[PDB]
């Protein structure tokens, strides 16, 4: 049940909280179809022993999943959710994506997360 990401995270670099414009946000995906562009960022945080002993926090990164995938493959979409923020391209269908899932390290690369261009991202984001 491993339940990775199918892209490469986005870095929180900044203060603000991850959020895109609705109709923003979904990443490029050749191997899914207009039906499929929808899902979630969840915030995932890293502690880490910092140069004086005392634990600190990494930046934190922002991993999507598509809707009805990943950690909270139960989670309709627009449900509030402190690290959860969701996205939808238009003209994609409120149904969860069993037909997208998630990745297996093992036998997939994560795809390099790309957004269409002009996408407004917020401060302090670009990540890879």
């Given at each position: 049940?491993?339940?990775?990401?199918?892209?490469?995270?986005?870095?929180?670099?900044?203060?603000?909280?991850?959020?895109?414009?609705?109709?923003?946000?979904?990443?490029?995906?050749?191997?899914?179809?207009?039906?499929?562009?929808?899902?979630?960022?969840?915030?995932?945080?890293?502690?880490?022993?910092?140069?004086?002993?005392?634990?600190?926090?990494?930046?934190?990164?922002?991993?999507?999943?598509?809707?009805?995938?990943?950690?909270?493959?139960?989670?309709?979409?627009?449900?509030?959710?402190?690290?959860?923020?969701?996205?939808?391209?238009?003209?994609?269908?409120?149904?969860?994506?069993?037909?997208?899932?998630?990745?297996?390290?093992?036998?997939?690369?994560?795809?390099?997360?790309?957004?269409?261009?002009?996408?407004?991202?917020?401060?302090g984001f670009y990540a890879?």
């Open positions: 049940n491993n339940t990775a990401s199918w892209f490469t995270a986005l870095t929180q670099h900044g203060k603000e909280d991850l959020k895109f414009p609705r109709g923003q946000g979904v990443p490029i995906n050749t191997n899914s179809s207009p039906d499929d562009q929808i899902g979630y960022y969840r915030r995932a945080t890293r502690r880490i022993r910092g140069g004086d002993g005392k634990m600190k926090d990494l930046s934190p990164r922002w991993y999507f999943y598509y809707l009805g995938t990943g950690p909270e493959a139960g989670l309709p979409y627009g449900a509030n959710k402190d690290g959860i923020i969701w996205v939808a391209t238009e003209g994609a269908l409120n149904t969860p994506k069993d037909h997208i899932g998630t990745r297996n390290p093992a036998n997939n690369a994560a795809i390099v997360l790309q957004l269409p261009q002009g996408t407004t991202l917020p401060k890879e």
